Scaffold this active site. Structure first.
Site, mmCIF file in Angstrom:
data_model
loop_
_atom_site.group_PDB
_atom_site.id
_atom_site.type_symbol
_atom_site.label_atom_id
_atom_site.label_comp_id
_atom_site.label_asym_id
_atom_site.label_seq_id
_atom_site.Cartn_x
_atom_site.Cartn_y
_atom_site.Cartn_z
ATOM 1 N N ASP A 1 3.895 2.110 11.254
ATOM 2 C CA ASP A 1 4.131 0.878 10.517
ATOM 3 C C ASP A 1 5.567 0.729 10.034
ATOM 4 O OD1 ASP A 1 3.579 3.031 8.734
ATOM 5 O OD2 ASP A 1 1.919 1.991 7.800
ATOM 6 N N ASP B 1 4.910 7.950 9.010
ATOM 7 C CA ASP B 1 4.418 6.673 8.491
ATOM 8 C C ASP B 1 5.402 6.066 7.473
ATOM 9 O OD1 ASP B 1 1.313 5.245 8.213
ATOM 10 O OD2 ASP B 1 2.628 4.948 6.502
ATOM 11 N N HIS C 1 4.743 4.541 4.691
ATOM 12 C CA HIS C 1 4.271 4.865 3.356
ATOM 13 C C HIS C 1 4.292 6.376 3.144
ATOM 14 C CE1 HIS C 1 2.173 1.021 4.545
ATOM 15 N NE2 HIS C 1 2.764 0.655 3.420
ATOM 16 N N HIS D 1 -3.046 9.027 2.538
ATOM 17 C CA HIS D 1 -3.057 8.639 1.127
ATOM 18 C C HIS D 1 -4.198 9.270 0.342
ATOM 19 C CE1 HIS D 1 0.250 6.041 1.636
ATOM 20 N NE2 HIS D 1 -0.393 5.030 2.197
#
Ligand code: NA
Ligand code: ZN
Length: 305
Positions: A243, A162, A164, A125
């Site tokens: 995740d 991931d 996200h 991120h």
């Protein structure tokens, strides 16, 4: 052989007792490598500190100077609503980026066939001038830019599975034809970007909430593999976040350990074809301690096959 990069300093980063991105994530990985006995087919390596030139291949000077100045002497210093630095976050983040750089040097040099960096805090991120969502420096992007500018590779691919979206990686490389980004991501979901105005080197597949692995396998097989076969990356870099697991409280997807095994096998096949098997993989998210341990071990085992 598979290198396994970590450092005790990474356990010292924490952002409050309530926070799911916690030191016991790394301990859960250590415990499962023991209980699976897969820790015996990897070689342990200590993560070094990343230097400034490594960081500035991705991030701005103001980004680096800000985090250095923000690093608190005691207590916490807020970055965003769920990201803060404690007096150890800076050193940990240097270890995490350091691991990714040193794994890259070791794989290109032929010390390892591939490597995994079991590190904290995560990276994908972190935009060139934005720390956010638990991430300070983009470990994976820093490793890929190391191989491009220092080892003079011409083409690399970044794989991000991931839950996200890796906004930080998209923000680093949307003008860089030497990079191909292939990913899956829950959509619409934090960070709420990556579905629109995709640069031609961006192959980021949005995934619906509650999707199970068969949707991801279909997506990877029908969408990623032809992009990757056309690109022929000379090395692969993995934002290995776990995740999207069924048991993760921070995602709403339903992968299981076998899916991560299957994905890693595909990464291996592409790398064997075009990259002399060269893979560097860095831990991103993943927050249920049992399923994180089980999923990293399935990933690592597939790297050591
Ligand atoms: Na993603
Ligand atoms: Zn995540």
């Amino acid at each position: 052989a598979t290198g396994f990069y970590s450092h005790a300093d990474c356990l010292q980063h924490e952002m409050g007792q309530w926070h799911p991105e916690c030191p016991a994530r790394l301990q859960a990985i250590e415990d499962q490598l023991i209980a699976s006995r897969i820790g015996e087919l990897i070689e342990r390596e200590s993560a070094p500190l990343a230097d400034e030139a490594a960081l500035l291949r991705v991030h701005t000077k103001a980004h680096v100077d800000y985090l250095r100045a923000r690093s608190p002497q005691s207590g916490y210093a807020e970055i965003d609503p769920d990201t803060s630095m404690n007096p150890h976050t800076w050193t940990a983040a240097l270890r995490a980026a350091g691991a990714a750089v040193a794994a890259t040097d070791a794989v290109i040099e032929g010390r390892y066939d591939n490597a995994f960096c079991s590190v904290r805090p995560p990276g994908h991120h972190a935009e060139p001038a934005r720390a956010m969502g638990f991430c300070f420096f983009n470990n994976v992007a820093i490793a890929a830019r190391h191989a491009l500018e220092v080892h003079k590779l011409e083409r690399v691919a970044i794989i991000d599975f991931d839950v996200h979206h890796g906004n930080g990686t998209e923000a680093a490389f949307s003008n860089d034809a030497r990079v191909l980004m292939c990913s899956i991501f829950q959509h619409p979901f934090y960070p709420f970007t990556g579905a629109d105005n995709q640069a031609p080197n961006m192959c980021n597949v949005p995934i619906a909430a509650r999707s199970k692995g068969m949707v991801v396998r279909e997506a990877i097989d029908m969408i990623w593999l032809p992009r990757l076969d056309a690109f022929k990356p000379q090395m692969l870099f993995v934002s290995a976040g776990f995740d999207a697991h069924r048991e993760d409280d921070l995602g709403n997807m339903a992968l299981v350990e076998d899916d991560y095994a299957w994905i890693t096998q595909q990464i291996r096949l592409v790398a064997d074809k075009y990259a002399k098997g060269r893979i560097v993989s860095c831990l991103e998210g993943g927050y249920n301690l049992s399923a994180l341990g089980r999923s990293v071990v399935a990933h690592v085992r597939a790297l050591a096959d």
